[PDB]
Design a binder for this molecule. Structure first.
Ligand SMILES: *C(=O)/C=C/c1ccc(O)cc1
Ligand SMILES: *C(=O)/C=C/c1ccc(O)cc1
Lengths: 376, 375
């Protein structure tokens, strides 16, 4: 009896930012309207990001009250931290409540809680905060993950799988709450690594309920977690780096990131699917972390995927941007929704087997083999 | 077939600080000798700590190079972080190598890696760094925990247990690498509790190998992980807090901590031991996180433990101080060593069942029921 995802709930900050209007917003609020040459470079990044809109906690009012966040490098961690700790908990609570509702069982039956946040370090953490906010059992077994990054959607499922399968009746609530107020900063002519994140990164929280041996009279399976793997891509040292500085979280990505990830996908697919006797990558439903448009294009190209395979993945990048660890769950959620709307036989686009990919710092690739559930 | 601890390896920085000489050292290097009343308060915290020595990465030389670390509240996260990331990695590597040696199997057989660090947030983390430093399988399944605190020794065992028991042949390397460069700071007259961190916190790394179904022809079981639990102590909100600020990791400890923990231990013991039909707390071997002597004295008194029950726990506090999540493993290591030396039948002082306690932010209590192995 495999660990099964039986509920998905999502949340995003109320402030919607249309990408077509973002280069004008970003340069105005950071008082960088005089940098014409750097504005054309950001317009190029935003138009080629394949993102239509993002939901961010940062507003014009927040940047006016805190001018140290509007600059590139300034001593601003304390003011970012205060908003980040409160924001991850608030967004996480909303996503959790939606997941708990779909699940259909009372929150008192949650035995384990896994919380994953890109940033927002606090002792006690977001896991404790969510236990209190959701009024969960004080004896809920918690796991708190700070600063893992974009691959963490796979990490939390990898963890939930072992918890659910080794503990009879265990019901795991996973909350991936990503907020980018920690990494929001002004542009600089001397730096070109941190400006890419201002165009691609979005905020969002996703929560899922995982459990083995579903009570089919009330619980409704969505996807089964068949196997999980984690690997470090060969010759990728220093490719995706993130440092929590006094100026907040700073991301440094090599231009080789899409090539390193894509050239390693066939190896991850082979290691995961050979014991299941599967070789056709187009026979699988795909949930891949959309780190950027280039990663998706190169994965499609090198693996030999048809245009419709990463359709849901691309749609989520288009509607929300890169929300780090939470993104794969928004894709997972939208996949079963679109599958139902298209009248398909399973939650995974009518297909039986599938794959979830998390990409991030290392370069780390999390490979989760999924099995869909039949839909009437 | 229960998840079993098959190896324990430990490491500490080379700089030894005798507690009897610490008040003078600390007040001199933080330029606080003029604060006579504050010195007395700190001197008493050190004398009542029941710590004889600690090993710290921080030196007088490092404080001279970085005066912003020596100050109570000065912008210093970046300089602390540079030393913290490198320090947790090298200390963790040393502990890991010792654990791998005792285990007896090649490092290529490690399928999972759990790393727990009080601080040193890095993307990629200490788990990645240790995978590279130890040249583990690039496909090692990693878990990285930053900023959990003092209960984490129980958390990592809780995780390792489920991993080992759900994955046939899984061999988990746990590395709890604790460095205080992130929180080492000068004293404050306004925040008297901050300096408790410099009176009690020591550096140290502990590594353990956990796996189910031991191959008895090579692997040697030390303790079995029977059951695990985690709970939040009632009415304990805000008692133990830590915030990662521009000045590094802050330390907040309210005076209610010993009473809150000690008045709740019997509930943790009852929840863990009633399904096993055990009610005599003295029939158990004890591995408790030594957050302070007051916690140990009050737990001994209210639970009704014999005076020498927490002997090993107190000895590790005496020899190394509070090394956060790594401490319980140093106690676990010393317990099996002392059991062997005292000619006792088991790794748990001759006793069958035992309990491991982790105490930290929340207040969170991690309760791990242990079973000893013959000597
Ligand atoms: C996830 O671990 C980080 C994703 C990301 C950060 C910064 C960028 O420029 C692009 C993607
Ligand atoms: C164990 O719970 C230690 C907690 C802690 C250590 C250091 C800090 O500055 C804050 C909390």
């Amino acid at each position: 009896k495999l660990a099964t995802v039986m509920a998905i709930g999502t949340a995003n900050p109320p402030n919607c930012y249309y990408q077509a209007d973002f280069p004008d917003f970003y340069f105005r609020v950071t008082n960088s309207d005089h940098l014409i040459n750097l504005k054309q470079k950001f317009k190029r990044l935003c138009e080629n990001s394949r993102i239509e809109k993002r939901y961010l906690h940062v507003t014009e009012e927040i940047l006016k009250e805190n001018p140290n966040i509007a600059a590139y490098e300034a001593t601003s961690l304390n003011v970012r931290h205060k908003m980040q700790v409160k924001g991850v908990a608030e967004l996480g609570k909303e996503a959790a409540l939606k997941a708990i509702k779909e699940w259909g069982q009372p929150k008192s039956k949650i035995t384990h809680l896994i919380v994953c946040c890109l940033a927002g370090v606090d002792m006690p953490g977001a896991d404790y905060q969510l236990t209190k906010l959701l009024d969960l059992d004080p004896s809920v077994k918690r796991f708190m993950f700070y600063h893992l990054g974009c691959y963490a959607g796979g990490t939390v499922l990898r963890l939930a799988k072992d918890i659910a399968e080794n503990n009879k009746g265990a019901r795991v609530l996973i909350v991936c709450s990503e907020m980018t107020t920690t990494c929001f900063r002004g542009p600089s002519e001397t730096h070109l690594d941190s400006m890419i994140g201002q165009a691609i990164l979005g905020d969002g929280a996703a929560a899922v309920i995982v459990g083995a041996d579903p009570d089919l009279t009330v619980e409704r399976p969505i996807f089964e977690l068949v196997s999980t793997a984690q690997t470090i891509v060969p010759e990728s040292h220093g490719a995706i780096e993130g440092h929590l500085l006094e100026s907040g979280l700073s991301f440094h990505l090599y231009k080789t990131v899409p090539t390193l990830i894509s050239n390693n996908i066939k190896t991850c697919l082979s290691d995961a699917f050979t014991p299941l006797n599967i070789s056709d990558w187009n026979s699988l439903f795909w949930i891949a972390h959309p780190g950027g448009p280039a990663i998706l294009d190169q994965v499609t190209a090198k693996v030999g995927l048809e245009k419709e395979k990463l359709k849901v993945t691309r749609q989520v990048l288009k509607d929300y941007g890169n929300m780090s660890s939470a993104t794969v769950f928004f894709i997972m959620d939208e996949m079963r929704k679109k599958s139902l709307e298209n009248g398909q036989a399973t939650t995974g686009e009518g297909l039986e087997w599938g794959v979830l990919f998390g990409f991030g710092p290392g370069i780390t690739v999390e490979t989760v083999v999924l099995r869909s559930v039949p839909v009437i």
